[PDB]
Amino acid sequence: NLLITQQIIPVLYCMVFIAGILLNGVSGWIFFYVPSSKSFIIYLKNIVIADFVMSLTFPFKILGDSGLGPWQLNVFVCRVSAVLFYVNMYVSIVFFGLISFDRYYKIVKPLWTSFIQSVSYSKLLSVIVWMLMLLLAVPNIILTNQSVREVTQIKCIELKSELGRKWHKASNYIFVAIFWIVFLLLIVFYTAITKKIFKSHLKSSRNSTSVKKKSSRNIFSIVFVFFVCFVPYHIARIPYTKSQTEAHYSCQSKEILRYMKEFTLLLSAANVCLDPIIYFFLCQPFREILCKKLH
Amino acid sequence: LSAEDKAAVERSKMIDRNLREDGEKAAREVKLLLLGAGESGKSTIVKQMTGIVETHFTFKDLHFKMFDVGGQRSERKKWIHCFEGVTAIIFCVALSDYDLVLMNRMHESMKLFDSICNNKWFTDTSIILFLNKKDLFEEKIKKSPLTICYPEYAGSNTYEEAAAYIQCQFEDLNKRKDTKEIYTHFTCATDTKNVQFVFDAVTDVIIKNNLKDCGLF
Amino acid sequence: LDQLRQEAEQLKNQIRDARKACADATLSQITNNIDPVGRIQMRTRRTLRGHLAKIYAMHWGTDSRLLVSASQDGKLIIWDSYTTNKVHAIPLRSSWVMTCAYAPSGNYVACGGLDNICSIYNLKTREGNVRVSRELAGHTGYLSCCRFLDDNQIVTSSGDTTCALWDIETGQQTTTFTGHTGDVMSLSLAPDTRLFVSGACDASAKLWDVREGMCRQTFTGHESDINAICFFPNGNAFATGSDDATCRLFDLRADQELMTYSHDNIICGITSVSFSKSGRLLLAGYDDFNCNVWDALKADRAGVLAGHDNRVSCLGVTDDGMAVATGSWDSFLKIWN
Amino acid sequence: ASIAQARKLVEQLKMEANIDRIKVSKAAADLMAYCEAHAKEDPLLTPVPASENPFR
Numbered sequence: 056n057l058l059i060t061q062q063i064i065p066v067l068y069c070m071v072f073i074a075g076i077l078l079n080g081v082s083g084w085i086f087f088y089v090p091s092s093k094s095f096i097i098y099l100k101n102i103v104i105a106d107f108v109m110s111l112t113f114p115f116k117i118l119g120d121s122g123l124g125p126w127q128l129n130v131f132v133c134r135v136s137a138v139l140f141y142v143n144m145y146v147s148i149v150f151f152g153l154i155s156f157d158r159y160y161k162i163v164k165p166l167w168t169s170f171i172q173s174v175s176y177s178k179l180l181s182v183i184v185w186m187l188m189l190l191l192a193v194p195n196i197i198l199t200n201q202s203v204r205e206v207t208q209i210k211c212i213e214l215k216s217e218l219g220r221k222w223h224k225a226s227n228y229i230f231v232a233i234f235w236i237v238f239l240l241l242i243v244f245y246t247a248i249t250k251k252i253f254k255s256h257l258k259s260s261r262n263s264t265s266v267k268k269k270s271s272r273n274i275f276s277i278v279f280v281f282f283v284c285f286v287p288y289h290i291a292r293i294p295y296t297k298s299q300t301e302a303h304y305s306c307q308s309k310e311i312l313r314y315m316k317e318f319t320l321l322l323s324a325a326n327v328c329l330d331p332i333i334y335f336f337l338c339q340p341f342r343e344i345l346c347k348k349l350h
Numbered sequence: 351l352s353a354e355d356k357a358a359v360e361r362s363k364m365i366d367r368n369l370r371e372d373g374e375k376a377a378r379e380v381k382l383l384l385l386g387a388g389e390s391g392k393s394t395i396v397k398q399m400t401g402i403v404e405t406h407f408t409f410k411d412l413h414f415k416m417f418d419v420g421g422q423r424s425e426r427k428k429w430i431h432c433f434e435g436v437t438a439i440i441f442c443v444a445l446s447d448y449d450l451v452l453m454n455r456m457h458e459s460m461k462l463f464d465s466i467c468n469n470k471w472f473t474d475t476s477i478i479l480f481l482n483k484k485d486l487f488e489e490k491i492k493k494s495p496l497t498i499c500y501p502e503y504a505g506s507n508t509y510e511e512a513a514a515y516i517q518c519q520f521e522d523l524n525k526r527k528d529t530k531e532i533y534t535h536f537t538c539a540t541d542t543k544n545v546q547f548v549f550d551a552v553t554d555v556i557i558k559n560n561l562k563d564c565g566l567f
Numbered sequence: 568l569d570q571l572r573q574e575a576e577q578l579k580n581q582i583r584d585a586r587k588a589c590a591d592a593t594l595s596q597i598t599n600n601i602d603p604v605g606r607i608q609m610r611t612r613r614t615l616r617g618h619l620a621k622i623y624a625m626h627w628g629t630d631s632r633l634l635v636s637a638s639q640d641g642k643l644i645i646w647d648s649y650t651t652n653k654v655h656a657i658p659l660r661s662s663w664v665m666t667c668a669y670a671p672s673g674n675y676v677a678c679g680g681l682d683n684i685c686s687i688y689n690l691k692t693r694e695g696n697v698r699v700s701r702e703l704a705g706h707t708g709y710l711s712c713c714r715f716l717d718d719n720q721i722v723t724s725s726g727d728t729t730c731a732l733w734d735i736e737t738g739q740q741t742t743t744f745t746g747h748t749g750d751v752m753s754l755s756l757a758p759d760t761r762l763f764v765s766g767a768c769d770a771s772a773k774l775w776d777v778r779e780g781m782c783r784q785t786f787t788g789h790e791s792d793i794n795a796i797c798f799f800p801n802g803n804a805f806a807t808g809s810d811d812a813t814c815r816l817f818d819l820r821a822d823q824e825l826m827t828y829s830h831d832n833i834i835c836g837i838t839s840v841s842f843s844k845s846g847r848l849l850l851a852g853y854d855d856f857n858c859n860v861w862d863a864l865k866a867d868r869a870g871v872l873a874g875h876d877n878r879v880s881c882l883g884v885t886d887d888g889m890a891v892a893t894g895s896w897d898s899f900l901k902i903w904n
Numbered sequence: 905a906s907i908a909q910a911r912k913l914v915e916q917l918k919m920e921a922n923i924d925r926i927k928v929s930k931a932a933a934d935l936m937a938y939c940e941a942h943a944k945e946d947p948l949l950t951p952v953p954a955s956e957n958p959f960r
């Protein structure tokens with residue numbers, strides 16, 4: 056409409072932008088002092104970086120979606136800000152998966168004994184994950200530098216070449232499949248961790264009941280936030296990408312799909328705000344350093 | 351780098367690898383600080399499982415190092431912090447010592463338990479409380495009433511009631527019941543379930559510590 | 568009994584009267600005229616990493632380059648401080664060591680702790696591997712400090728309220744010092760190695776003649792256990808850090824406390840004490856995760872060495888005074904210039 | 905036991921009582937003079953040039 060994606064969606068983006076940038080800037084301030092003694096802290100550091108980059112991309116959305124200085128704001132949001140936001144979102148998703156796998160490996164102590172699994176050298180795998188995500192995302196900014204056919208109607212795929220459009224469809228499908236692989240792995244690993252927590256701690260005492268309840272609440276919060284933020288987006292990202300790169304088959308579903316995609320992407324972006332309260336806060340060294348500095 | 355400098359860097363890297371391997375091996379070990387009084391059954395527990403007595407034993411694929419600091423006879427405050435990162439503390443209390451005196455022996459045992467449990471270095475360290483000599487305590491509870499140790503005791507003068515009362519009195523000394531757990535076992539002579547109890551307690555402690563290290567508890 | 572106690576009280580009163588008589592002025596007013604040292608801005612040049620548990624002791628080499636450190640993980644690491652390289656890594660039979668020493672010749676390293684034994688390791692073995700050369704049996708209490716006095720004798724203090732000079736070749740206590748009432752927590756050998764001061768848990772420091780074996784002087788004033796002690800470079804004075812938040816500088820010739828180094832903002836105890844090469848700076852490690860560099864002459868806090876995430880358990884200064892190495896409970900050694 | 909310890913403590917106090925103590929002013933002056941003499945040779949009082957610094 057006119058008061059949904061221009062007068063409301065930008066406002067919610069501004070709210071999530073502030074409530075994410077403040078927390079993630081404080082978290083980046085704290086995490087520079089927190090040593091990387093374990094892979095969990097390394098992944099939390101990378102997640103802080105990704106969330107800060109997403110929060111930095113948010114003002115471009117807010118403004119360009121609401122209003123243009125030149126049309127350069129809108130074509131730039133198509134070109135630069137959106138690609139960085141998406142690559143950082145999927146970096147955050149795969150790092151959530153990596154955190155899930157290390158939690159499974161530590162708590163469960165699986166049958167992968169005699170195999171190294173994921174112990175140490177997590178900086179290298181974090182770097183190769185960033186490199187794979189950027190290898191997927193760079194063509195989506197280099198190939199989208201086409202002229203603007205209509206100044207006021209600027210669809211992000213109209214600014215894209217034949218190879219550009221082919222790789223846009225390929226990257227979306229690949230990223231949706233990557234998210235679903237990470238989501239299945241995360242569900243499996245957290246189910247296994249919850250099963251490991253279910254055993255033991257049979258004392259009906261304050262400590263045992265407290266540790267079971269808190270661990271289960273944290274796991275349920277992690278899985279629920281992951282679901283609510285990302286599953287609505289990626290169960291509707293494939294149809295929306297089909298709608299973008301579409302032979303003529305629709306008239307108005309191309310609009311309800313875009314509203315659905317924008318709202319589900321806002322849901323996924325809300326994780327920049329919901330991330331410190333479920334991931335960083337429970338980190339013992341991070342909380343200790345914050346309590347030492349923030350008092 | 352020169353040949354000597356290259357060799358020195360290679361030697362340092364070999365030392366680094368050896369240190370990493372040693373630390374990986376040591377992080378899998380369960381550290382158990384053993385504490386108690388003179389009348390406590392620490393010796394019997396050690397036998398069934400100069401300054402510090404170190405006992406290494408493997409149970410159910412877990413390697414335990416139990417460190418007995420008895421006989422140190424020095425100020426605990428100057429070296430107890432050396433056990434700050436200990437996995438668990440096994441505190442032994444002789445039940446039959448309720449009627450004995452050095453001040454009652456069990457009162458001194460309670461004072462030591464409260465000092466160990468409520469000091470700064472063991473805020474979150476779990477305590478396995480062994481209540482030894484349950485057979486002798488049951489034999490002697492029929493003649494010496496528990497009132498001489500706990501004048502406020504009002505329950506029946508039976509073994510079960512008195513044992514539960516003593517265990518509750520020791521557990522009430524915990525000032526961090528929300529964070530620290532006290533595992534109480536009634537050890538005695540010819541008891542083969544003590545090491546299994548320690549294994550279960552340290553398994554619970556290890557799961558808690560893993561959850562904490564994962565940012566999950 | 569009563570008569571002996573009365574005589575002891577009279578002797579203590581006479582000692583206090585003599586001390587008050589010889590205290591005509593104070594160190595603070597004599598050093599009030601001299602210019603302040605300013606602000607110490609020492610920076611971390613090296614970070615020796617590789618220890619995996621709390622570091623309890625360190626000791627510089629007489630070459631001011633090699634540096635031994637002891638960790639609770641049962642490791643005694645000899646570092647090349649210039650290049651950060653690890654020259655040696657000795658696996659200790661007991662992981663509960665709380666002290667370590669470096670021989671002035673550099674041929675041996677001492678360690679010890681809760682096992683009540685001082686282990687002397689030979690670094691210059693012909694086989695190329697470091698092996699323990701001696702184990703000193705004695706000290707029915709935990710051994711808290713050891714200081715090499717040449718390559719054949721060593722002074723070690725323990726938690727049985729006694730110190731001992733051992734002959735390493737024979738392994739037997741040549742001399743025993745049995746004046747302290749509380750656990751002796753620190754040692755310091757004079758530059759001539761003819762006297763040494765020991766601070767104990769009885770809030771007392773004692774000066775012992777190594778050759779005579781008797782206590783020369785006793786120094787009081789601290790309100791809690793003395794954890795660290797160090798001679799002035801002149802050897803005519805020493806500094807003590809204790810469980811209260813104050814250091815104290817005592818003088819042997821005056822037999823009195825010259826200076827106190829305390830601050831209201833400091834409430835934690837003091838773990839390590841060392842002087843700079845000139846003795847103008849007094850470096851003390853604290854429980855508040857820092858090191859304070861005081862103007863030893865002016866008692867002013869000249870600077871703060873910060874960068875240890877846990878308690879600074881030990882610190883030392885090189886023989887040439889180029890650097891200061893501080894180990895901490897965070898398993899890290901930091902070298903500062 | 906107690907009598908022997910008390911006698912030993914009395915003897916030690918007597919030995920530590922009859923010693924030659926110099927004035928605090930003289931000892932403090934000597935300490936200050938030692939600090940002043942070695943001020944130029946202390947690398948921590950004044951920063952050594954990075955060329956001569958082995959920890960640069």
Ligand SMILES: NC(=O)C1=CN([C@@H]2O[C@H](COP(=O)(O)OP(=O)(O)OC[C@H]3O[C@@H](n4cnc5c(N)ncnc54)[C@H](O)[C@@H]3O)[C@@H](O)[C@H]2O)C=CC1
Nearest residue numbers: 060116120132133137138141142192195211223226227230
């Ligand atoms: N997984 C993915 O989908 C990835 C996509 N990219 C690239 O990022 C770019 C973004 O593509 P899409 O978001 O699918 O295109 P789109 O048509 O959904 O919108 C493009 C971007 O511009 C903004 N925008 C433009 N017009 C808007 C309007 N009327 N209302 C609200 N927002 C508006 C949106 O916030 C969006 O981020 C694409 O060029 C794509 O190649 C890059 C990496 C991964």
